[PDB]
Structures are given as C-alpha cells and as structure tokens.
Amino acid sequence: TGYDLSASTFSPDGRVFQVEYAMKAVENSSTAIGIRCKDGVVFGVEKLVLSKLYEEGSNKRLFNVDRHVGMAVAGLLADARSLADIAREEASNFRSNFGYNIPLKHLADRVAMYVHAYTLYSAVRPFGCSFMLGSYSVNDGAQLYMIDPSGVSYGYWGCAIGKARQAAKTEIEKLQMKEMTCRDIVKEVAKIIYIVHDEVKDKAFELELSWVGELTNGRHEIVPKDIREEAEKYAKESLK
C-alpha cells in the first residue's frame, strides 16, 4: 500500500510491486506448457472455450513469431497479442538488417528487453502475459525460452505458465525430455495438459498443439490434426 500504485516506485524493502501484480495476473490464466525434445520443441496450451458460441480456434494462444519461432502465451490475451506483434517486428527487423533468421536466444533477449522496458516507467504498466519462445535449427539445435512480465528470460528444458503451473512442473520432471523425439512427446504433452485441468471449475477447453523440430524441417507450424487427434486419444487413455 502506497508504494504499489506505480511501476516506477521501489518498495521500502526494494521490490517493484507492479511487476509482482502483473505476475499474479499471469498466474490467474490457464496452463501453457512447452517441452524441448532431443530434436525440437513442442508447444501445448490449454485454451478454455469461455462460451460455446466461439469458433473452435478463436483467440488462440499459439502464435508464430517467425517461420521457425513459435510463442505459447499465457495471461492477458491483448498484451499477449501485442507482444506477439512486437516479436514479429523484431524478427523481421533482424532478418532485414542481418540477412539470416534471428537466433532464439537473441530474439528472446530483445523481446524481454522490450518487456522489461515497460516495468521502468510510471506512464506504462508491465505486460500482463507470460510467453515462451521455441525454435529449432540444426546450427544451434532446439531452444526454449520463457519470458515473464519481469523481463527475465533463460532457456528451459521444459516450462509451464498459468494456473496449474506447479502440477505441470511436477509431472514434466518425470519425463526424460533429453532423449525423446518430437513424435511421442506430443502425446505426452497432451497427457500432461489433460492432467493439469480442473474440469469442475473450468467448464471445457479446446486443446491446441504446436511444435518446431527436425520433422517440421526447422519450421514452426500448427501440429497436424491427423496426429493431434492421436495425441488427444493418448491423453484420454490416461484416466485423468
């Protein structure tokens, strides 16, 4: 109280409260997980359908930053879409000024610095969305970076963001992502998403998958339905 009204005021104990509040906004959203294969990165988010009138794909949280980069936002969807636009702009500028695809580490660092710049001023508020970036290229392998409203971003072997972050993390540790390929790990991602779902507080959800790896020739695209359905079947095979 008193020190939490603006993003530029330090608390007496020394913590920017607005950033923590924006974090709490992210924690209020649904779970989005990304698992790095031995040979790629797979994205899966739990997209709740708020009303049945929607169009089985409206306001999707899976965004294509570039040909090889994918984003799996979780949080305030307007801020997430704006951040996806900023990431696309950064990737396009990097490609235009340097001639080659932006490395995932550099893109994550730049988008994080853009995010962190919004926790520095009183006239702007920190972003209310947390997003994870994934890409694959034979030159530098598979990378997966998660960026939260603070602007901090390090690579992850496997990360979750949203309400059931903790449960998704407990389940994802018992997976040996170091050696598995991006084929069965998609079924695993579907199974974890189905485990992390309340189903009595959240009425329904539409599972959407995404990946980038060797089997997608280094590009990021929507997971094909002809194997997304089998991932869903494996998820149903698990009782929860």
């Binding site: 008193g2 330090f10 994080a112 962190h116 710049a117 690579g155 072997w157």
Partner: protein, 239 residues
C-alpha cells in the same frame, strides 16, 4: 520523514533520497552473492549459480556476462534490470571503441554506466536499475582492475569487493584477508574468492552451483571457468 520516499527526485528533510536506498535494497532480492578479488596479475570474480529447478537450462542461467573480450562483469540484483544494464554497457564499450579507437578502460566503462544511473536518479523518468554491476579487466600501466559501481551512480576501484544479500559479511571477511600482504597469485586469488563466498554462505560449494570468471595479465581475455577447472580449484583449496 516517511512521506518523502515516494518520488526519487524529492529530498528527505535530513537530506536523503529514499528511492535510491530502496533500489539498493532491491539488489538483495535476487538472493545471490558475488565477490571479486584483485590479484597482483589477475582479477577473479565468483558468484552463486542457483538453479532451484531441474528443468532450467543451466547454460542460460549464468550471471557472468562478457561486455567485451578484455572486460567482464558479474551482475547481482534483479535479473531483467541487470540484463538491461549489461546491454547498455556493451553498447557503451562498442561506441567508445568506434569513437576513440582504443578499447574503453574498465573504470571509464562503468563510470559511464554510473553516469547513466545518476542521470536516471536525478530526473524522475525511470526507476533506477535495481542491479549492482561489478566490472573486471586487465588495463595497461595499471594491472588488474575490478570496479563495483551501483544504481546510485557511485563507482570506485576495489582491491576486493562483493555485492548481494551477503555483502557486509563477505566484505568483513575480505578485510580480515586483505590485510596480510602475500603473493596474490591466480591460484591464491581464486582460492580466496571461493573461501570468501563459502564461509559467508556456510556452504560446501558443490561445483555445479558456483560459476567463476577471471582475467589475467598473461591472458587479458575474459574467460569463464568450466566445471573441471572449478572442481580443480575447489580440491586445491580443500587441501
């Protein structure tokens, strides 16, 4: 007295800037501690590498950021602000090299960084970067140099220094240590840094949790010690 701590540009009745002090207190939020020691011909920095999760990529959690080949840094404090400050430092070093030819000395480098921090703390436009910057680098005619320089914009040269949650105890240990004149050798410098951090932390210092970077007169290039050299230094330290 307590009403003057909401804007950085407002002076306390006793003549203090409370927002700057709060930013200083924000440095300890990371829960990490970094210590830097200057030898006769080398400068060694070590810092905690906390990975409280098996799924983190330990390669990307490193707090040692290389400003240039002959200038290195360790950043303690809030992560995002520290990363912004290192990007600014790299830009400043590159601009100095482009504008004057010769590489920027370490003191001048984060003296410019501290000038940026000070202009931040004077004009109330952005919050000061809650991150302490510790610089190293071999400089000609002056030997090794390590300068710690802070959000307030205060920069100084140190024979040894440290910043983080466990700052005062580590500085007291170094005071007890840097009073006995002895050959400050590479081995001895790394050993004394590791002893400082271990004793202040009261931790056995498994090699996976400490990350070390050193610049030497013989090799004036910032080099980050990998697992093998860190373990060798620890075992040489124990015996």
């Amino acid at each position: 007295s307590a009403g003057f701590d909401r804007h950085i540009t407002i002076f306390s009745p006793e003549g203090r800037l409370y927002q700057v002090e709060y930013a200083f207190k924000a440095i300890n939020q990371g829960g990490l501690t970094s210590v830097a020691v200057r030898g006769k011909d080398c400068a060694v920095i070590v810092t905690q590498k906390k990975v409280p999760d098996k799924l983190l990529d330990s390669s990307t959690v490193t707090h040692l950021f290389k400003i240039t080949e002959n200038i290195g840094c360790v950043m303690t404090g809030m992560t995002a602000d520290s990363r912004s400050q290192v990007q600014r430092a790299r830009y400043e070093a590159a601009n100095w090299k482009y504008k004057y030819g010769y590489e920027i000395p370490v003191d001048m480098l984060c003296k410019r960084i501290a000038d940026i921090s000070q202009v931040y703390t004077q004009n109330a436009e952005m919050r000061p970067l809650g991150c302490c910057m510790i610089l190293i680098g071999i400089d000609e005619e002056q030997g090794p140099q390590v300068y710690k320089c802070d959000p307030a914009g205060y920069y100084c040269g140190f024979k040894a220094t440290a910043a983080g949650v466990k700052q005062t105890e580590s500085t007291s240990f170094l005071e007890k240590k840097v009073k006995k004149k002895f050959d400050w050798t590479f081995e001895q410098t790394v050993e004394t840094a590791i002893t400082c951090l271990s004793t202040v932390l009261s931790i056995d210092f498994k090699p996976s949790e400490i990350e070390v970077g050193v610049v030497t007169v013989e090799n004036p290039k910032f080099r980050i010690l990998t697992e093998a050299e860190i373990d060798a230094h620890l075992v040489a330290l124990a015996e």
